[PDB]
Ligand binder design. Structure first.
Ligand SMILES: *[C@@H]1O[C@H](CO)[C@@H](O[C@@H]2O[C@H](CO)[C@@H](O)[C@H](O)[C@H]2NC(C)=O)[C@H](O)[C@H]1NC(C)=O
Ligand code: NAG
Ligand code: NAG
Ligand code: BR
Length: 425
């Protein structure tokens, strides 16, 4: 019989990490692996029905998505939902699926609010979530002895899925819960020169350990301004929250990363400014199955989905959809083996939560709350070359920070700055 999967993702817009053009080829690869394992889903064939989260304007919507989920639910009685990826689409869809007691799988929806599983029942997140970044910051602060204060600056585009707002919301709640520190925050608009005076005033008076969520250019600009104001690596550290690594190039091999470089006549000043800057990204999976996945994903997307998949950290999302689907397929199989059936959402979800699995993204742990443990990398500058590289990795499960390639964290004075200045703010 059929195990029907309902997909609510962006079907025509190709610009999201969870767009169908990237997730669809990944899902196909997953279903081919399943089809070649007869021990899986004994007497059940996975079929896919598709609905779009996009409004007329072509963006993922808080309206189009639940309307589509409702339609797919009536027409197909799906055993499970795949997606949505956008916070704004996921929020209403997840409340519906919870009410239907039908499992929803996603590698998007990183927002804090989705982690409230009393509301978002049977939602399993197999991609990153923003509280996990709070875990990473928590670890950093314990490693480096920062136990009092931090400042967060963040900005977003005109009005959308507000990635940076949700990143900060996630970071703030988790960090406050575990470290009891004071976390000042401050929103700004990127294209507005009126906002810079207040940003630089806030850096001066509100913190010394500083987190910035913004476009690569807004970060560079702020660093240049910080330098000109005599705010240097001795008293300050600036973390760029750039989870998908936009400020950095991919498939570089031995070509050194110089995120401070523009050829705009400020490169020397930028390099000098970036001595005080470190970059926080998701961890690039390093296992060989992943590189094979990327090879296969690229070929399939170009062939059947009319789309060129670029190298980048964004590709972890479709791979996590891939892995999530397989984790779900294993769970259903285990449920069938012990007398259950495919529509037993609660029993299927219990078998995914608090569990380890091996997939193209490597080792993956889903925590007790149904959210994947997320790994992070910290990049900083070789003072000799100006180049950036990964110097620390964070394992989301063990909560361990490990040195990478025997590198040392760069500090101008050889030790990190205190989070409170010796004379007060
Ligand atoms: C695909 O999605 C992107 C958004 O993720 C669309 O681009 C935004 O479009 C709105 C108007 O709808 C603008 O105000 C934003 O500033 C745009 N932002 C970005 C990031 O470009 C894009 O138009 C969509 N494309 C299609 C064909 O539907
Ligand atoms: C606590 C925990 O999850 N430990 C796991 C172990 O069970 C697994 O066999 C190993 C393989 O990578 O990774 C680690
Ligand atoms: C992360 O730590 C966990 C828990 O010890 C371990 O299972 C896993 O193998 C680690 N991840 C990697 C990629 O080493
Ligand atoms: Br979506």
């Amino acid at each position: 019989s059929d195990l029907t999967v309902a997909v609510v993702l962006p079907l025509t817009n190709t610009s999201y990490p969870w767009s169908w053009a990237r997730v669809g080829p990944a899902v196909e690869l997953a279903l081919a692996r399943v089809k070649a394992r007869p021990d899986l889903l004994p007497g059940w064939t996975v079929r896919m029905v598709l609905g779009s989260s996009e409004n007329a304007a072509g963006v993922c919507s808080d309206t189009a998505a639940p309307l589509a989920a409702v339609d797919l639910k009536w027409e197909h009685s799906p055993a499970v939902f795949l997606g949505p990826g956008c916070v704004y689409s996921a929020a209403p869809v997840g409340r519906f699926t919870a009410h239907w007691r039908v499992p929803l799988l996603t590698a998007g929806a990183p927002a804090l609010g989705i982690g409230v599983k009393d509301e978002y029942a049977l939602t399993t997140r197999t991609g990153p979530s923003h509280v996990k970044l709070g875990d990473f910051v928590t670890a950093l602060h314990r490693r480096l002895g920062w136990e009092h204060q931090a400042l967060v600056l963040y900005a977003d585009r005109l009005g959308d899925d507000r990635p940076c707002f949700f990143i900060v919301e996630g970071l703030y709640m988790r960090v406050r819960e575990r470290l009891n520190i004071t976390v000042n925050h401050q929103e700004f608009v990127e294209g507005d020169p009126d906002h810079y005076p207040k940003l630089l005033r806030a850096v001066r008076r509100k913190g010394r350990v500083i987190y910035i969520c913004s476009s690569p250019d807004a970060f560079r600009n702020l660093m240049l301004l910080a330098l000109n104001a005599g705010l240097t690596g001795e008293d300050y550290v600036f973390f760029h929250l750039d989870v998908f690594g936009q400020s950095l190039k991919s498939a570089q091999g031995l070509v050194p990363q110089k995120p401070w470089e523009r050829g705009d006549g400020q490169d020397r000043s930028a390099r000098q400014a970036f001595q005080a800057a470190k970059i926080i990204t998701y961890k690039e999976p390093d296992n060989p199955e992943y590189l094979e996945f990327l090879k296969q994903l690229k070929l399939l997307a170009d062939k059947k989905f009319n789309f060129t998949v670029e190298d980048g950290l964004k590709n972890i999302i479709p791979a996590s959809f891939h892995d999530g689907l397989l984790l779900y397929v294993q769970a259903v199989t285990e449920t069938l083996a012990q007398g259950g059936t495919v529509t037993d959402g609660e029993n299927i979800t219990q078998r995914m939560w608090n569990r380890s699995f091996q997939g193209v993204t490597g080792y993956l742990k889903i925590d007790r709350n149904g959210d994947r443990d997320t790994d992070f990398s910290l990049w900083d500058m070789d003072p000799e070359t100006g180049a950036f590289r990964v110097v620390l990795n964070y394992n989301g499960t063990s909560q361990e920070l490990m040195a990478v390639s025997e590198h040392k964290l760069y500090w101008p004075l050889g030790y990190p700055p205190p989070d409170v200045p010796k004379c007060g703010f």
